[PDB]
Amino acid sequence: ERRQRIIDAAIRVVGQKGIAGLSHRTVAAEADVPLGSTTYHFATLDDLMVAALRQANEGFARVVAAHPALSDPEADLSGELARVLGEWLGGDRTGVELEYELYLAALRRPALRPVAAEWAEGVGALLAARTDPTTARALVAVLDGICLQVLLTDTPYDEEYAREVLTRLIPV
Amino acid sequence: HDPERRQRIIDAAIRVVGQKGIAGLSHRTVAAEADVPLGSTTYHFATLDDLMVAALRQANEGFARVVAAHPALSDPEADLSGELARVLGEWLGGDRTGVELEYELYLAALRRPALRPVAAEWAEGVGALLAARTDPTTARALVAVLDGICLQVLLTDTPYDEEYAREVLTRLI
Ligand SMILES: CC[n+]1c(-c2ccccc2)c2cc(N)ccc2c2ccc(N)cc21
Ligand SMILES: CC[n+]1c(-c2ccccc2)c2cc(N)ccc2c2ccc(N)cc21
Ligand code: NI
Ligand code: NI
Structure with missing residues (x-):
């Protein structure tokens, strides 16, 4: 649902900024959603990375x-x-x-x-x-x-x- | 051309990358390691890419x-x-x-x-x-x-x- 809308935002952010440019704030911006929803579904970045x-x-x-x-x-x-x-x-x-x-x-x-x-x-x-x-x-x-x-x-x-x-x- | 300071700059960059990887590699990080000033670390390697290439x-x-x-x-x-x-x-x-x-x-x-x-x-x-x-x-x-x-x-x-x-x-x- 949002995990999706925010996952494609991670592949879009890595493809663009490379891992170094990937932070909850970084993706929450792409996905165009709140910092708290990005942090919700993926506690750590490592999780939002395996997802990607x-x-x-x-x-x-x-x-x-x-x-x-x-x-x-x-x-x-x-x-x-x-x-x-x-x-x-x-x-x-x-x-x-x-x-x-x-x-x-x-x-x-x-x-x-x-x-x-x-x-x-x-x-x-x-x-x-x-x-x-x-x-x-x-x-x-x-x-x-x-x-x-x-x-x-x-x-x-x-x-x-x-x-x-x-x-x-x-x-x- | 200030060679020895530069040797220990590249020596620390490797140490840094070995126990902290690239994630924790930067002028502050290396300068603190080699125990050189910092403008010294930037003096020899303009960019980080420069020190990495070197290390x-x-x-x-x-x-x-x-x-x-x-x-x-x-x-x-x-x-x-x-x-x-x-x-x-x-x-x-x-x-x-x-x-x-x-x-x-x-x-x-x-x-x-x-x-x-x-x-x-x-x-x-x-x-x-x-x-x-x-x-x-x-x-x-x-x-x-x-x-x-x-x-x-x-x-x-x-x-x-x-x-x-x-x-x-x-x-x-
Ligand atoms: C998984 C990466 N990977 C490998 C691959 C590279 C090294 C080792 C094993 C597989 C690959 C190998 C061949 N011959 C042909 C196409 C692909 C490929 C195609 C698309 C993709 N998105 C990832 C792809
Ligand atoms: C340069 C890395 N590398 C390779 C190597 C690995 C993958 C592809 C080509 C070479 C290597 C390959 C063999 N057989 C034996 C020893 C080494 C080695 C030994 C020391 C070092 N510091 C780097 C080394
Ligand atoms: Ni084909
Ligand atoms: Ni041998």
């Missing part, structure tokens, strides 16, 4: 939801992944940056650990179901390193590189 | 210090994946104060353009060693998967499995 990311996590589903080849016996997995991956990182990255920002905030924010471990959740499940539970962790580990390389160092996205390295891990 | 590059020079400490990484016979996975399990030796603060600096670039240059030097230490012992493309993935394997452990309190890390790294060779 737990909702973001969804988006990843909707995505796999849209591409069938991912759950398809053949197609590929690697080509499909490299492909769709270049999409999410395509052009304006205000979305991925807020998502990664939060997810990585689990480095020093304990409350944010459980949600963080629910990252690839939207594929980590699928991959281990398509392959094994050692290749699942693997693939998500390559994706992370591959995505961190682009976002943190200005290196452009190399889809063939990624489509190339993803295969090596996935056995036959 | 990072100094800690990250230890990576080149270990790659040297294990010549076996170059032995063209030696199993790189295993050696790579072992020295890594070493860097992760408990209460990763070293690791946690470096990566936090490394990852801060996500939203700070100024930190993107040092963020490009994160795996510079093993650079010549990976170019000469594999290929440029296999080379990038080792890093990508090393950073990936590292996030799982730091971001989710799950423990490092060198044995799992040697298989993954191998699968790419």
